[PDB]
Amino acid sequence: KLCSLDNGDCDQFCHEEQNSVVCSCARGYTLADNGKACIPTGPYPCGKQTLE
Amino acid sequence: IVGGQECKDGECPWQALLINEENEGFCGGTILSEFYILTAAHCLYQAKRFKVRVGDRNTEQEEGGEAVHEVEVVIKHNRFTKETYDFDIAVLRLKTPITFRMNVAPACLPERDWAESTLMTQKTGIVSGFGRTHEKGRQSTRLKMLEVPYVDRNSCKLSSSFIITQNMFCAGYDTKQEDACQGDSGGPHVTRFKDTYFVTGIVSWGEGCARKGKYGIYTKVTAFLKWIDRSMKT
Ligand SMILES: CS(=O)(=O)c1ccccc1-c1ccc(NC(=O)c2cc(C(F)(F)F)nn2-c2cccc(-c3n[nH]c(=O)[nH]3)c2)c(F)c1
Ligand code: NA
Ligand code: NA
Numbered sequence: 001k002l003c004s005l006d007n008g009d010c011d012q013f014c015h016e017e018q019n020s021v022v023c024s025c026a027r028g029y030t031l032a033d034n035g036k037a038c039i040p041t042g043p044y045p046c047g048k049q050t051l052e
Numbered sequence: 053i054v055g056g057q058e059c060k061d062g063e064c065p066w067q068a069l070l071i072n073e074e075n076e077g078f079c080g081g082t083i084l085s086e087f088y089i090l091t092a093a094h095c096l097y098q099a100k101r102f103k104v105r106v107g108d109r110n111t112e113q114e115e116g117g118e119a120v121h122e123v124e125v126v127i128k129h130n131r132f133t134k135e136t137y138d139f140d141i142a143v144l145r146l147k148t149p150i151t152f153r154m155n156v157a158p159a160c161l162p163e164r165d166w167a168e169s170t171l172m173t174q175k176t177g178i179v180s181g182f183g184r185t186h187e188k189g190r191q192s193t194r195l196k197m198l199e200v201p202y203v204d205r206n207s208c209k210l211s212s213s214f215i216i217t218q219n220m221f222c223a224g225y226d227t228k229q230e231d232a233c234q235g236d237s238g239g240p241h242v243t244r245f246k247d248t249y250f251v252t253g254i255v256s257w258g259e260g261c262a263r264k265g266k267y268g269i270y271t272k273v274t275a276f277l278k279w280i281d282r283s284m285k286t
Contacts, residue, residue, distance in 0.1 A: 003166075003169070003170075007170060007245075007246075011246055011248070012160075012166075012245070012246075012248065013162070013163050013166045014166060014170070015165075015166075024163070026160040026161065026162070026248075026250075027161075038248075043152065044152030044153070044156075044157045044158075045157075046157070046158045046159060046160035046161075046248075047066075047158075047159055047160035047242075047248040047249040047250055048157060048247070048248065048249075049062050049063055049065065049157075049249070050062035050065045050153070050154045050155060050156070050157050051061070051062040051063070052062075
């Protein structure tokens with residue numbers, strides 16, 4: 001299933017490489033140590049509502 | 053937008069408004085980064101000289117965080133024609149960078165395959181804008197948003213008099229009389245994925261607004277990602 005099963009547990013982009021899940025993020029985000037979560041590099045990251 | 057809801061504080065921060073010499077909004081845009089705006093190519097025919105307004109939610113009240121940006125470069129897709137409405141995409145480079153703040157933030161650009169397999173397969177997206185609130189009406193003074201179901205490609209082609217190309221997609225309702233309208237053109241169609249909003253479409257056209265059996269037609273952003281990426285290097 002990989003990326004077809006809950007986006008491979010990725011926060012954002014999911015890719016299949018050598019029958020394994022590879023996560024990546026959009027610009028302005030860094031891939032977390034768990035290789036799944038996407039961490040904003042500074043304020044106003046893309047795609048976040050400014051509700052606070 | 054016909055029907056839908058007002059964009060509340062900080063809800064639609066990627067919305068940009070194209071304003072003519074008379075300071076009146078005529079088209080929408082999507083904020084991609086501090087220097088770039090994504091819009092519809094056909095919007096560039098609506099006015100001779102135009103500026104970009106960001107952080108605006110209400111055109112009657114001069115807000116805080118609201119800013120006017122002049123266009124340095126207009127990057128229009130050379131394949132656009134009014135006979136087909138195909139390739140209805142443009143990128144604008146601003147003279148000065150946008151200051152991100154409450155109500156001012158860019159939408160994410162997805163990667164092609166993931167956008168097609170994951171974003172485009174979600175039940176809905178969100179369209180927003182300052183366009184007409186009824187097929188026969190004036191431009192809205194308030195920024196509105198509307199959750200729109202993704203429409204099956206076959207139903208989309210069957211619904212239309214005009215040719216729906218591979219650079220276009222349908223979204224909307226068959227019965228519910230809520231949709232985008234004139235003046236919403238060039239504005240964002242975003243899809244939420246785990247609390248992150250990715251730009252998936254550009255409001256392109258429709259046969260009237262909110263008409264039963266008809267849908268909003270959007271430029272498919274995935275089809276132009278490399279062209280968008282390229283445009284941002286210049
Ligand atoms: C040869 S061609 O005919 O140029 C052609 C040839 C080939 C393909 C398409 C076309 C084509 C172009 C434009 C239109 N017409 C429009 O775009 C239009 C009129 C009005 C007006 F009624 F307010 F005036 N509004 N809009 C508008 C604007 C924006 C969003 C929505 C929208 N989104 N969702 C929804 O339901 N409507 C509605 C058309 F029908 C067909
Ligand atoms: Na305002
Ligand atoms: Na409809």
